[PDB]
C-alpha cells in the first residue's frame, strides 16, 4: 500500500508475532521471503497468486492468506 | 475427464447445478479472465493440441461440451461478472 | 512429380519458424533455427537443427531430419519471432510482451535479455493485447498491434523509446519494408497504409482504398524479384499487386482465388513463384500462368488427383503465342495454386523456402520438407 494521506495525530499500527527463541510468525519478509504473481515466466519460473482471484478489477487487494514462520 | 463427467452427472440436481455453476466460475478452470497473475490460456486446449490428436480419439472435448450443455440447461446465469468476474460466456 | 517430401512425425505442433541468421549474404540453409511454439508441450521456443540440402543429407530418417537442441518456455503464444542479428532474437508474446534473447548455440541455451513488458492494449476494458507485427532491421525495431499503436525502439532497451498514438488507428494484418526506412501494411478494412520511419504523427501517415473490391487484406510481402513492388491477399480471393515508395498503383489484380488469402510468402530461387498457407483448410503452391498445358501446380499434390508436368514450345517460325502478363487491363485470371494433402494434414502454421528447398512445421504434429520444389 501507499500511505500518502499523512495528516497528523494518526491511527494505529501493527506487529508480527514472536516465536520461541527468535522464531518469527511473519506476514512480511526479511531478506527474500515472499513472491510476486504469474505462474509462467520466460526464464523457466513459476510464482504465486491469490489476491486477484475474487476481482475482475483490483483495488490493491493486500490481504494476507499465509503467514510463514521462520527461525 | 472422469472428474468432469462425474460433475456432469451430479449437476442433474438443479441447486447442485447452480452450486457447480458458481463454483466453477469462481475457480476459472479454463480461461475466463485474461488479467495476468497466472498461466492463462491453458486447459483442454493444450491437451487437445498434444495428445488427443495423436490418439485420433477425442473424448474429453465432447465430454466438456456436454458439461457446458448441462450447466446451461439446468443452471441459468444469475451473474457472470461486474468488475468482479468476467461477465459473459463469450470466452468459452 | 516434384521432389517428394520428407515427413518427420515430430509429435509436435508448430507456429513459428525463422532462419538462424548470419546476415550479410549467403545461400546455405541455416542448419540452426529457432522455433516458436504453437503448442509443443507448452508454448516455448526451441532450438533445432536441419541437415541442410540433399548433399551430405539423405539420412537420419528419409531425406534428413531436424533435431531438438534445447528450449525455454514462454508466456503468450509465439505469433511472430524475427532475428535482429546473428544471435539476438525478438518474439512477440500473446501476453503483449516483447521478448529478446541472445542464443548460446554452444551452450545450447537462450539468454533472457530484454523485455518490453508493455505493449498494445485494449481501451475501455483495460485488457492486454498481443503484437500483430514485429519489424527488425538491425538495430531499429518496430512493433504494430491490433489497437493500432506504433512502437519504435532502438535495440537494447526495456522501456518504450516511443509509441506513436493516434486519434485514428485500426486493426493491422501484414507489414513489409518498402524501403530501408519506409513501411507498408495491409489492414482489416481493405486498407493500404504507408509510413516513413523518420516522419510520423497523429492518425495514419497514409491511407488508401479504391475500387476493385476492397477486402480485409491479411498478408503482404515484397516480391522476390523486387521490394518496392509488393503483393497483398485478402478476403475476396483476388491478389493485388502495387508499386510504391510514396504512391500506390496496380501491377495486377489477379483473380487467383475466390476466398481469403490468409498468408502468402515468396519463392527465393524463383522470384516469380509464390506460396500460400490458409487455415481455411488448405495450402497452395502458386505458379506463373495457368492451364495444365504447363506443369500443373494447380491440382498437384493431394496424394491422388495428381496432375503436372506437361509442356510444349513453339519454335517461333510460323507459330505465335500470347499470355496474360502482356495485358495491362486489370482483373486477370487464376494463376495456378495447388493444394497438397499427403495422407492427412492439420493447420500448417509455419513454413520457409530457401532456394528450391522448403521446410514447414504444422499442427499435423509433424514436419514436411523438400529439396526441390519442381522437377
Automatic annotation (TrEMBL), chain A:
It comes from the Eukaryota. It is found in: Nucleus membrane; Nucleus, Nuclear pore complex; Nucleus, Nucleoplasm. Plays a role in the nuclear pore complex (NPC) assembly and/or maintenance. NUP98 and NUP96 are involved in the bidirectional transport across the NPC. May anchor NUP153 and TPR to the NPC. In cooperation with DHX9, plays a role in transcription and alternative splicing activation of a subset of genes. Involved in the localization of DHX9 in discrete intranuclear foci (GLFG-body). Belongs to the nucleoporin GLFG family. This is Nuclear pore complex protein Nup98-Nup96. The chain holds residues 1104 to 1174 of 1790 of the full protein.
From TrEMBL, chain B:
The gene is nup205.S. It comes from the Eukaryota. Belongs to the NUP186/NUP192/NUP205 family. It is found in: Nucleus. The chain holds residues 641 to 732 of 2011 of the full protein. This is MGC83295 protein.
Automatic annotation (TrEMBL), chain C:
It is found in: Nucleus. InterPro entries: WD40/YVTN_repeat-like_dom_sf, WD40_repeat_CS, WD40_repeat_dom_sf, WD40_rpt. It holds the Pfam family WD40. Keywords: Nucleus, Repeat, WD repeat. GO terms for cellular component: cytosol; nuclear pore outer ring. Its main location: nucleus. The keyword Nucleus applies. WD repeats lie at residues 210-252, 254-296. This is MGC154553 protein. It comes from Xenopus laevis (African clawed frog). The gene is nup43.S.
